[PDB]
Write a protein that binds this ligand. Structure first.
Ligand SMILES: COc1ccc2c(c1)ncn2[C@H]1O[C@H](COP(=O)(O)O)[C@@H](O)[C@H]1O
Ligand SMILES: COc1ccc2c(c1)ncn2[C@H]1O[C@H](COP(=O)(O)O)[C@@H](O)[C@H]1O
Ligand SMILES: O=C(O)c1cccnc1
Ligand SMILES: O=C(O)c1cccnc1
Lengths: 346, 346
């Protein structure tokens, strides 16, 4: 794991310089395609990409797990919805499923700790039947966190071996916006009230209780912000851990990962705390409608491309941004050149 | 034309109510897909869509023309770039071309007034060899504006007959950001300094001159803000007029039109002034990096989906947003339902 972390490659400045020059010579005013140009350059620097912006196969990894903190009354969706919805993922009827199909991406459903019987068709990496209730203690042990990180990381890099060049991260876990808020509060130093949202339609009245729970979780566990694994283990969840592991695996593999929404921002904060080398592999998708989104993104120094007021999770935003990634590649490879037209612009 | 305008259909509230109900029953927390849901409902209300969000064939119409105001030193691209780039459109090497191909859309290049010889392969609707220099007089006659509006409108609705269900608008015309700024200033009541941008890389020094030109154009022509045709004719351009005509045609046809960037916002302001019934058919794409973008969008009451810092034009932003439109349809038609899973959420 420290091995793993040690071996995350730095970006290829050489490939990036060549990319920049090629982009500048395209049939358009220099810098006119804005963030699409920046994106292309970013991809060119990713070692698993072979020195050029390119997209081969695409995968969305959905980490599913239950949370003990559900018992605190912080979520209106019945607990069983996790198990149910996870099954639906196998049937292609969920939001991520439909959006991934539209993007030509494959959905990988991974059970990291659903509190139910194993679901056929779902990848089994179950830590336990739900994590500990963070309001009264830690979500899991450090050991458990590290092992999961490891296992997911490897799974992720292994897909790379099969042609996958672009990942998307997602989750499923009733009550997950609670640990997500806890982590954000911890990593950013923001007060709970500022980062606690309505999640999956929590009634406005019920908010106060969710804020109290987050505060308790923190007071009780005393997670150390300078140790991402400490935070994840104490106030995170299996699903959050799993998402962080996808990020570590893709980066080790020198490949890009598309973030999703709020849950994903929290995992990204952890990943970056754990290994700053991860940052350059991260690509934002959309701007989550969760209250704590702005704060989270500011800390990651990220500005999403899509403003859709989305708050579903599952990796739905990630899937939706995949075409953008492909667009940057198309621009790069298929546009004509100024010189070839005898066009000269300042 | 008044006929044309009179006949723009209102949206189908009946279809929209049915759509809303169907969306609410999908396998997700109600309203969780945010703007994608709103979008779906919008499309369902469009009469040419047959009561449901659907996308058949896609087309991007690119209106090309030259401007006399170029002689005022408001643009650094050589005049000839219009003719050149227009030719390139036929070769599929431009930015819109590449992005449209990615979206599975067809590009229609229309010459409404390029100051050069006719280009083979380009649709010929040429008013004149470039429009009048708005700094010293009007761009064209009212008659000319109205005829073009008419001709483009019809062309647009005719494509509908061929399977096109989604349009995108674009342009090409060195110096076009100048009349675009003039129109915006006029329609929004904003001072020129506030809406004049760098266009296609105008050096910061040269800005002052562009502002002066815009002011002169206005002072001299005295365009009436309450008459969109008056404004277009006086301080617009053939390309701007052509874009407005696509909007009027799609709306008459009861079909959706995707806006592009800055040039397109100016045309949209005119179209809406001319016929408010047009509004509901308009769909924003991205948030142009042109200085006057925010002001323009505020007046249209529109919030774009894509924040890409793009400033190319050509209909590139429009093409880039097409997948989003298709996503809304996919969501609508392919997601499973709560009831079918025995799931009940507040
Ligand atoms: C079909 O029913 C559902 C319900 C919720 C769902 C979902 C489907 N898919 C994602 N979520 C989202 O809601 C949960 C987070 O919000 P909270 O913290 O309020 O529980 C997670 O499951 C997240 O994936
Ligand atoms: C290959 O060279 C070019 C140059 C400009 C181009 C372009 C390609 N495609 C769009 N534009 C954009 O730049 C022009 C508006 O900016 P300004 O008002 O400063 O001239 C229009 O042609 C617009 O389409
Ligand atoms: O932003 C998200 O991904 C999100 C917000 C609320 C509930 N589930 C997911
Ligand atoms: O926003 C646009 O569409 C734009 C901005 C500058 C130059 N051309 C087009």
């Amino acid at each position: 794991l420290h091995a793993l972390l040690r071996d995350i490659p730095a970006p290829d400045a050489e490939a990036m310089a060549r990319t920049q020059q090629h982009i500048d010579g395209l049939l358009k005013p220099p810098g006119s395609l804005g963030r699409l140009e920046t994106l292309a350059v970013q991809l060119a620097g990713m070692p698993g990409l072979n020195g050029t912006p390119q997209v081969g196969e695409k995968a969305v990894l959905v980490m599913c797990a239950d949370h003990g903190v559900w018992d605190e009354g912080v979520a209106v969706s019945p607990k069983i919805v996790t198990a149910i919805q996870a099954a639906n993922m196998t049937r292609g009827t969920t939001g991520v499923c439909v959006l991934a199909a539209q993007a030509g991406a494959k959905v990988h459903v991974i059970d990291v700790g659903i509190d139910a019987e194993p679901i056929p068709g779902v990848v089994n990496m179950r830590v336990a039947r739900g994590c500990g209730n963070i309001a009264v203690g830690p979500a899991m042990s450090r050991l458990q966190a590290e092992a999961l990180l490891l296992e997911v990381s490897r799974y992720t890099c292994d897909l790379a071996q099969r042609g996958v060049t672009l990942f998307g991260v997602g989750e499923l876990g009733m009550a997950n916006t609670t640990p997500a808020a806890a982590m954000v509060s911890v990593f950013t130093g923001s007060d709970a009230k500022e980062v606690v949202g309505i999640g999956a339609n929590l009634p406005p009245s019920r908010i106060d209780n969710k804020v109290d729970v987050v505060r308790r979780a923190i007071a009780i566990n005393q997670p150390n912000p300078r140790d991402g694994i400490d935070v994840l283990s104490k106030v995170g969840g299996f699903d959050l851990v799993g998402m962080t592991g996808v990020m570590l695996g893709a980066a080790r593999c020198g490949l890009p990962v598309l973030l999703d929404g709020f849950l994903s921002y929290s995992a990204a904060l952890a990943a970056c705390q754990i290994a700053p080398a991860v940052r350059p592999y991260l690509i934002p998708s959309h701007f989550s409608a969760e209250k704590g989104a702005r704060i989270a993104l500011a800390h990651l120094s990220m500005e999403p491309y899509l403003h859709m007021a989305m708050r579903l999770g599952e990796g739905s935003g990630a899937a939706l941004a995949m075409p953008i990634v492909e667009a940057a590649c198309a621009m790069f490879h298929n546009m004509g050149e100024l010189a070839a037209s005898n066009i000269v612009l300042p």
